[PDB]
Symmetry: none
Subunit: 61 residues, 10 copies
Amino acid sequence: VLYVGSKTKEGVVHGVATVAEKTKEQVTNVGGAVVTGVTAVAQKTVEGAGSIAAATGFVKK
Amino acid sequence: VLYVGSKTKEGVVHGVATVAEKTKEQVTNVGGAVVTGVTAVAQKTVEGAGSIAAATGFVKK
Amino acid sequence: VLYVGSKTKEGVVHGVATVAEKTKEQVTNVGGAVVTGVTAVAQKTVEGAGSIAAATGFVKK
Amino acid sequence: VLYVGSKTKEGVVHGVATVAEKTKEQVTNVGGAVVTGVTAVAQKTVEGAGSIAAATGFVKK
Amino acid sequence: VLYVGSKTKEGVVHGVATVAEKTKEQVTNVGGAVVTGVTAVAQKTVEGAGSIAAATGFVKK
Amino acid sequence: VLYVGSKTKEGVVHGVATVAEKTKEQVTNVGGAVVTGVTAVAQKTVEGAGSIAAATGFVKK
Amino acid sequence: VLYVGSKTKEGVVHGVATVAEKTKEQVTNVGGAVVTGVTAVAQKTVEGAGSIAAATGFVKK
Amino acid sequence: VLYVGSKTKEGVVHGVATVAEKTKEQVTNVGGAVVTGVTAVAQKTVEGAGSIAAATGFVKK
Amino acid sequence: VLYVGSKTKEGVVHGVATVAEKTKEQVTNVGGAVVTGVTAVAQKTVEGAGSIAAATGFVKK
Amino acid sequence: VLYVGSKTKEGVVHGVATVAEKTKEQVTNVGGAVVTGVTAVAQKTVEGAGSIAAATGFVKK
């Protein structure tokens, strides 16, 4: 027997509940990067890379 | 027997609850990077890299 | 028998509850990096790197 | 028998509850790095590195 | 028998509760690094490094 | 001016989040009363009565 | 001016978050009363009565 | 001016977070009353009565 | 001026966090009353009565 | 001026955090009254009575 893999869970998200009450919100940006409100995200990668909520102002070369 | 893997959990998030009440919010940015409000995120990587909530103002080369 | 792995948990987050009440919030940035409000995040990496809430003002080369 | 691994837990976070009440908050930044409000995060790394809440003003080379 | 590993716990955090009440908070930064409010974080590393709440003003080379 | 009532809140419930993970549940009853799993309920009464989660085995007269 | 009432809050519940993880639960009853799992409930009463989680085995008259 | 009431709070519950992890639970009853797991409940009463988590085995008359 | 009431708080509960980890629990009852696990409850009463976590075995008349 | 009441707090509970870890618990009862685990409860009463965690075996008349 070579039962290498079974009943496995790799990068999983599964019981999640959120509530958000706002009166105002004023996300505002100039030449930059905003990431906001990220919830319930999963992933798996082989021989690569991973990123979920990445911001970068810029990359000047 | 070579039961190498079983009933495994690698990068998992599974019982989560949040509440947010705001009257105002004024995320504001100039030439930079904002990451805000990140919740319930999982992942797995082989032979790569990982990042979840990364900010970077810029990369000038 | 070579029961190498079983019932394992590597990078897991699973019972979590948060409440946030604000009247104002004024995240503000100029040329920099803000990471704010990071909750319930898990991951696993082989032969790479890991980062969860990384900020960097900039990287001038 | 070579029961090398079993019922293991490596980088786990699992019973957590927080409450935050604010009237104002004024995170403010200029050319720097802010990390704020980091809760309930776990991870595992092989042959790499780890970081959870890292800030860096900048890296001038 | 070679029961090398079992019922192990390496880098775990699991019963935690916090409450924070503030009227104002004025995190403020110029060219530096702020890390603030870090709670309930665990991790494991093989052949690498570890860091949880690291701040660095800058690294000029 | 007789500004008797304004901007009032009488019996209100408004920011609420719950998560429940079970493998089994075996509510079982014989001749009795079970109330179970009651969440997020509000009401107002004038010149009457109120009840939310009331159980009564029986009323033999 | 007779500003009798304003910006009032009478019987209110408003920022609440819960998580429950169970493997088994075996609520069981014979001729009695069970109330279980009551969360986030509010109410107001004039000239009456109030009750939220009341159990009574029986009332034999 | 007769500013009798203003910005009042009478019977309020508002920032609350709980986590519960169980493997088994065996609530069991015979002819009696069980109240269990009561959280985040508020109310107001005029000229009446109040009760939140009341148990009574029975009332034989 | 007759500023009789203002910015008042009467029966309030507002910053609260709890964590409970159990392996078993065996609440068991015969002809009696159990109240268990009561958290974060507030109320106000005029010209009546109040009770929060009351148990009574029985009332034989 | 008749500034009779202002910025008052009557029966309030507001910054509270608890953690409980148990392996077993065996609350058990016969014909009696158990109250157990009562936390974070407030109330106000006019011209009535108050009780929070009252137990009574029985009242035979």
